[PDB]
């Protein structure tokens, strides 16, 4: 019906500023250290 | 039907115990979420207002 010259345009529904736009194509119209290895009792203990 | 968690607590508990050990279990335990899909392109497709050879013919006729 609406198809024009081999083009299948059929599958279409047919029934501030106020600009006007064209329809169908819109455009303007833990762990804490332990004592060892912490450097005491490694220089100490006079007993 | 809204949520998708495994509905039985026993299988979840067994799953997490075996996971703590390091072993697997038989059943599947997926994470919680809502159900539903979004299958786009298994859906609205590109309309073809043109025919098969409309564009090439327009090219030859230069329009």
From Swiss-Prot, chain B:
Top-rank lineage group of the source organism: Eukaryota
Subcellular location: Nucleus
Similarity comment: Belongs to the RSC7/SWP82 family. SWP82 subfamily.
Additional record remark: Present with 3180 molecules/cell in log phase SD medium.
Subunit (UniProt): Interacts with SWI3 and SNF12. Component of the SWI/SNF global transcription activator complex. The 1.14 MDa SWI/SNF complex is composed of 11 different subunits: one copy each of SWI1, SNF2/SWI2, SNF5, SNF12/SWP73, ARP7/SWP61, ARP9/SWP59; two copies each of SWI3, SNF6, SNF11, SWP82; and three copies of TAF14/SWP29.
Function as written in the Swiss-Prot or TrEMBL entry: Involved in transcriptional activation. Component of the SWI/SNF complex, an ATP-dependent chromatin remodeling complex, which is required for the positive and negative regulation of gene expression of a large number of genes. It changes chromatin structure by altering DNA-histone contacts within a nucleosome, leading eventually to a change in nucleosome position, thus facilitating or repressing binding of gene-specific transcription factors.
The name this protein goes by in its record: SWI/SNF global transcription activator complex subunit SWP82
Gene source species: Saccharomyces cerevisiae (strain ATCC 204508 / S288c)
Residues of the full protein shown: 275 to 337 of 623
